[PDB]
Scaffold this active site. Structure first.
Site, short mmCIF file in Angstrom:
data_model
loop_
_atom_site.label_atom_id
_atom_site.label_comp_id
_atom_site.label_asym_id
_atom_site.label_seq_id
_atom_site.Cartn_x
_atom_site.Cartn_y
_atom_site.Cartn_z
N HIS A 1 7.49 1.91 5.25
CA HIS A 1 7.99 3.03 4.62
C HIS A 1 7.17 4.03 3.95
O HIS A 1 5.80 3.73 3.80
CB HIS A 1 8.90 2.75 3.50
CG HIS A 1 8.52 1.73 2.52
ND1 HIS A 1 9.07 0.34 2.17
CD2 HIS A 1 7.50 1.60 1.73
CE1 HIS A 1 8.47 -0.33 1.56
NE2 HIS A 1 7.33 0.51 0.99
N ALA A 2 7.57 4.98 3.15
CA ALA A 2 6.50 5.85 2.60
C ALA A 2 7.01 6.27 1.23
O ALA A 2 8.29 5.93 0.90
CB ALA A 2 6.34 7.12 3.53
#
Ligand SMILES: Cc1cn([C@H]2C[C@H](O)[C@@H](COP(=O)(O)OP(=O)(O)O[C@H]3O[C@H](C)[C@@H](NC=O)[C@H](O)[C@H]3O)O2)c(=O)[nH]c1=O
Ligand SMILES: Cc1cn([C@H]2C[C@H](O)[C@@H](COP(=O)(O)OP(=O)(O)O[C@H]3O[C@H](C)[C@@H](NC=O)[C@H](O)[C@H]3O)O2)c(=O)[nH]c1=O
Ligand SMILES: [Cl-]
Ligand SMILES: [Cl-]
Ligand code: NA
Lengths: 144, 142
Positions: B61-62
């Site tokens: 994810h970010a």
């Protein structure tokens, strides 16, 4: 004994002992601290001491302005803190244990295990002039 | 030869690889970095990840705003970083190696060794809403 609560104060002036939040689950383990909350300052610097030979002794300084915070992130090591009047040894042997060293705390670090790593957060950028490096001089500066 | 120099820029946008000042003496080693100098932000938080099973894959994810900085202080792990166009893997296997993940870097940490301990500095306190979890959304945003 000494790191059982989230926060407890030493007899040594201003020194505090901390137990950081820890999450142990199926996927691994995580410990976390927040600056200005769990560690009582914001850091300008971090450093790590490692690869210390068996029975070697480091420290023997106090800092005039630099606040420090110590966590042994691997292995174990022992720390002596000394306010001039009172001194105590604490054993940093797990990643969730941390110790706050305010300015003008004479400190020594010793008994590092072979794979020990000591992490230090510091309020000030590195400055060789911030050190008091002999004990008697330190004692004069601590007198009431 | 990715952490050869003090500083090098990844092809992954804004990612930087770092080699820290190291002083050895008879009493062992000290490595150091300074915030807003070698490490390009000041943290509000640190966390450590440890005791990770060898097959685990973490992240994927970010972050919208949170800057991170990763140093593997014991043992080794690998990091995959993606800006939506380029992706690279880096191996954090020494205490004097660090990697900067700016916001909007889709990240993975995996291949942890048994004894690995990963230290992370974060620019923001923990925020459950700081996450981008949909890769298509992430690419659109970039
Ligand atoms: C902290 C530092 C050192 N050096 C350099 C100075 C020395 O050449 C070498 C080792 O430093 P030193 O002999 O003081 O290591 P030690 O005896 O292990 O003491 C260090 O760790 C202690 C926990 C600290 N607190 C109380 O003693 C000390 O502030 C810290 O210095 O690292 C930096 O360049 N940049 C830096 O930021
Ligand atoms: C980082 C954190 C978690 N928790 C709690 C929230 C989660 O329940 C659990 C672990 O979080 P998570 O599943 O994200 O672990 P990972 O999958 O390892 O991802 C973590 O490390 C990564 C380097 C970061 N970015 C990855 O690309 C992430 O910011 C960081 O979260 O610990 C904190 O309480 N306080 C905290 O500061
Ligand atoms: Cl103790
Ligand atoms: Cl690499
Ligand atoms: Na003296």
């Amino acid at each position: 004994n000494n790191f059982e609560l989230k926060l407890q104060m030493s007899k040594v002036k201003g020194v505090s002992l901390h137990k950081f939040h820890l999450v142990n689950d199926l996927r691994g383990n995580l410990s976390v601290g927040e600056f200005e909350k769990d560690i009582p300052f914001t850091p300008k610097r971090y450093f790590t001491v490692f690869g210390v030979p068996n029975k070697e002794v480091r420290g023997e300084h106090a800092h005039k302005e630099c606040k420090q915070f110590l966590i042994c992130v691997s292995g174990n090591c022992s720390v002596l803190v000394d306010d001039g009047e009172n001194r105590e040894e604490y054993v940093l042997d797990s990643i969730d244990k941390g110790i706050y060293l305010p300015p003008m705390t004479w400190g020594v670090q010793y008994k590092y295990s072979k794979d020990a790593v000591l992490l230090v957060f510091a309020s000030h950028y590195y400055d060789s002039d911030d050190y008091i490096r002999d004990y008697s001089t330190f004692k004069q500066m601590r007198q009431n």
